[PDB]
Every structure is written in structure tokens, then in C-alpha cells.
């Protein structure tokens, strides 16, 4: 079980799709093995540059301690999904608490 921070930006009009998506991925995590520590939804805010002809993406942050398998298939699920414009997964040391 390794700790990973997962930050993605989802589309402006696909901000309405965010919560069940989240639980789907939590069904990917907690249904397989893992544990969600922080799940902090930033919501829509302004990019510094127009990624894909558009500003104002909807940011989601997820800190999660999980094995490598589930996050491999989660990265494959993040890639071919057309709702997210960018995703970033990092291996941190521990799990964190505060915003």
C-alpha cells in the first residue's frame, strides 16, 4: 500500500458529473483494497492558461493509500475518459489531514 495524491481537472459542463464519478473511483479504491484519507473538491476555478481552448476547470483532490494495481487501472480510466483534461498522480511519503 503506497500513498498517492491524485489531482485531476474535469470539464466545466462536466462539473455536474463529479460526485458519482468520485464514488465510482472510491468503489475502485475501497472496493479493491484501499483507503481514502482526504477527498477535497476544489470546484471550478480559473486556469492560468486556456487548456484546450477553455478556462475555468473543476479541480478534485484525492489523497489515498492503495496498492499499485488499482491506481494503474485508475490512470487508464483517467486517460480515455473525455471529461478530465489533466490528471496528476504522485507518490508521497505518508497520508495527510488538512487542506
Amino acid at each position: 500500500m503506497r500513498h498517492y495524491e491524485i489531482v485531476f481537472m474535469v470539464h466545466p459542463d462536466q462539473s455536474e458529473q463529479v460526485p458519482g464519478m468520485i464514488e465510482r473511483y472510491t468503489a475502485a479504491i475501497t472496493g479493491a483494497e484501499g483507503k481514502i484519507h482526504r477527498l477535497e473538491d476544489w470546484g471550478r476555478r480559473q486556469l492560468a492558461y486556456p487548456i484546450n481552448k477553455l478556462h475555468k476547470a473543476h479541480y478534485v483532490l484525492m489523497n489515498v493509500e492503495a496498492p499499485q494495481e488499482v491506481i494503474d487501472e485508475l490512470e487508464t480510466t483517467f486517460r480515455f475518459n473525455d471529461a478530465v483534461i489533466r490528471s496528476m498522480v504522485m507518490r508521497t511519503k505518508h497520508a495527510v489531514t488538512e487542506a
Partner: peptide, 8 residues
Amino acid sequence: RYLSLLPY
């Protein structure tokens, strides 16, 4: 910068 919280 990669996450567009800062400009390049």
C-alpha cells in the same frame, strides 16, 4: 505550473 495554478 503543470496544474495551471501558476502561469508559465
